[PDB]
Design a binder for this molecule. Structure first.
Ligand code: HEM
Ligand SMILES: [Xe]
Ligand SMILES: [Xe]
Ligand SMILES: [Xe]
Ligand SMILES: [Xe]
Ligand SMILES: [Xe]
Ligand SMILES: [Zn+2]
Ligand SMILES: [Zn+2]
Length: 153
């Protein structure tokens, strides 16, 4: 697990995301889709977007970015005691959206990239390491639920 000092790094950085949830959310989803266009295919809602300019122009995509970061923020704020918040998410992503664990790894990389881009002064290697650990813990617990339900990977 994360040490107290590492959770402090994560939660203090997260406060910076909360100062502009829509901007960070938009940037993270665009970075995911550009870096890994195969992830687009999983969203019937977005698969029509073919270019980066189209992604930037979509109000619906910006709305979903808020949904994603609001859910992730609720989880991080539980400092690992996130069973009630994580369960519904693991269920829907395994059984309904059918999202492989690898794509959760890809979105974790996009989050780190955007935090670095937006906060070059604030988000040094120690915070980056701590954020990586927090997202790993998130993935580990989702993966366990996937395995339970017979999806895993
Ligand atoms: C940071 C990790 C992620 C969080 C916190 C997250 C959160 C959510 C939330 C809260 C919803 C709406 C409720 C629901 O259906 O459960 C949702 C919908 C969805 N998510 Fe995720 N998600 C994450 C990663 C991903 C990834 C990597 C993909 C695909 C590559 C994905 C695919 C979807 C799809 C297809 C929907 C349904 C969208 C719609 O048609 O309305 N999610 N996500
Ligand atoms: Xe996001
Ligand atoms: Xe998820
Ligand atoms: Xe994640
Ligand atoms: Xe972010
Ligand atoms: Xe987490
Ligand atoms: Zn890829
Ligand atoms: Zn707008």
């Amino acid at each position: 697990v994360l040490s107290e000092g590492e959770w402090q790094l994560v939660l203090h950085v997260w406060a910076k995301v909360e100062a502009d949830v829509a901007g960070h959310g938009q940037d993270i989803l665009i970075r995911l889709f550009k870096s890994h266009p195969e992830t687009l295919e999983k969203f019937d809602r977005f698969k029509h977007l073919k270019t980066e300019a189209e992604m930037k122009a979509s109000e619906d995509l910006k709305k979903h970015g808020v949904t994603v970061l609001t859910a992730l923020g609720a989880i991080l704020k539980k400092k690992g005691h996130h069973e009630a918040e994580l369960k519904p998410l693991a269920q829907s992503h395994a059984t309904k959206h059918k999202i492989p664990i690898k794509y959760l790894e890809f979105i974790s990389e996009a989050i780190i990239h955007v935090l670095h881009s937006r906060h070059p002064g604030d988000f040094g290697a120690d915070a980056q390491g701590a954020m990586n650990k927090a997202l790993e813990l998130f993935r580990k617990d989702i993966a366990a639920k996937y395995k339970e339900l017979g999806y895993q990977g």
